[PDB]
Amino acid sequence: KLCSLDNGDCDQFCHEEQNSVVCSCARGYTLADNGKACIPTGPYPCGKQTLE
Amino acid sequence: IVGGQECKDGECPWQALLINEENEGFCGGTILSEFYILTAAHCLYQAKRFKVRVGDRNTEQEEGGEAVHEVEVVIKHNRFTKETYDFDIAVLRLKTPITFRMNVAPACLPERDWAESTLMTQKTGIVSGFGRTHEKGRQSTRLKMLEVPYVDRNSCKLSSSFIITQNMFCAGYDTKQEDACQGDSGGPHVTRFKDTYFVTGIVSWGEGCARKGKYGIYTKVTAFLKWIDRSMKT
Ligand SMILES: CS(=O)(=O)c1ccccc1-c1ccc(NC(=O)c2cc(C(F)(F)F)nn2-c2cccc(CN)c2)c(F)c1
Numbered sequence: 509k510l511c512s513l514d515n516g517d518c519d520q521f522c523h524e525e526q527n528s529v530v531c532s533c534a535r536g537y538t539l540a541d542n543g544k545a546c547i548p549t550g551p552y553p554c555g556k557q558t559l560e
Numbered sequence: 561i562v563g564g565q566e567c568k569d570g571e572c573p574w575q576a577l578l579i580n581e582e583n584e585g586f587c588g589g590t591i592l593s594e595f596y597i598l599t600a601a602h603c604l605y606q607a608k609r610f611k612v613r614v615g616d617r618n619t620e621q622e623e624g625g626e627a628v629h630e631v632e633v634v635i636k637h638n639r640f641t642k643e644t645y646d647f648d649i650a651v652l653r654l655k656t657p658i659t660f661r662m663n664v665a666p667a668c669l670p671e672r673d674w675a676e677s678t679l680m681t682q683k684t685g686i687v688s689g690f691g692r693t694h695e696k697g698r699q700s701t702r703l704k705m706l707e708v709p710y711v712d713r714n715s716c717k718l719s720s721s722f723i724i725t726q727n728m729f730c731a732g733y734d735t736k737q738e739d740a741c742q743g744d745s746g747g748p749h750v751t752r753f754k755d756t757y758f759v760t761g762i763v764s765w766g767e768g769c770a771r772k773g774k775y776g777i778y779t780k781v782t783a784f785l786k787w788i789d790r791s792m793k794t
């Protein structure tokens with residue numbers, strides 16, 4: 509199933525390479541060490557509501 | 561927006577409002593970055609000279625978090641025509657960079673393939689704006705948001721009196737009286753995935769608003785990602 513299965517456990521973008529899951533993020537986000545989570549680089553990353 | 565709810569503090573930070581000479585909103589837009597706004601091409605035909613306001617939620621009181629930005633360059637898709645309303649998309653590069661803060665933030669641009677198989681296959685999306693709250697009414701002074709379910713392409717086409725091209729998609733309700741309306745055009749249609757909102761559409765048109773058997777028509781963002789990218793480098 510890979511990406512077809514819970515988005516391959518990715519926080520955001522998910523594609524398959526070598527029949528394996530590879531996660532990626534939108535600009536302003538850095539891929540975490542686990543290669544799945546997307547971590548913001550600043551106080552206002554794209555796509556996040558501002559609840560402060 | 562007909563029906564739906566008021567956008568509470570910080571819930572729709574990527575909403576932008578195009579204001580004319582008289583300082584009144586006539587169309588919406590989406591913040592893509594500190595310098596770029598996404599909107600509808602048909603919104604450009606109105607208002608010879610216009611500005612962009614971000615961070616607003618109540619057009620009446622001057623609140624304090626609002627900010628106006630002049631447009632440096634207007635990038636309208638050349639294939640757009642009032643005769644078909646196809647290619648209803650445009651991008652605005654502002655003179656000065658938007659400063660992000662409470663109620664001011666960009667929506668994420670997704671990847672084509674992923675967006676189509678993961679975002680647009682979602683049950684619903686969210687549309688927002690300061691448009692009319694009824695087909696016959698004035699522009700809303702309060703910013704509203706409305707969750708609109710994705711509509712099957714087949715149902716979409718047969719329900720429409722006009723041709724639904726591949727640069728368009730349906731969202732909304734068959735009979736329930738909630739829909740986007742005049743004035744929301746050019747505004748955001750976002751889809752949430754794990755608490756992150758990605759731009760998926762642009763309020764484009766519809767036969768009236770919240771009419772039974774009719775749906776809201778949006779410009780399909782995934783069909784213009786490359787065009788958007790090229791435009792943001794202009
Ligand atoms: C030019 S054509 O007809 O030959 C045409 C040609 C080819 C394809 C499509 C169209 C077409 C149809 C209706 C319209 N009319 C509207 O889109 C509209 C009117 C109103 C209000 F006046 F309020 F009734 N609100 N409104 C609208 C705006 C945004 C979203 C939604 C969603 N519910 C509705 C429009 F522009 C274009």
Ligand SMILES: [Ca+2]
Pocket residue numbers: 616617618619620621622623626
């Ligand atoms: Ca205001």
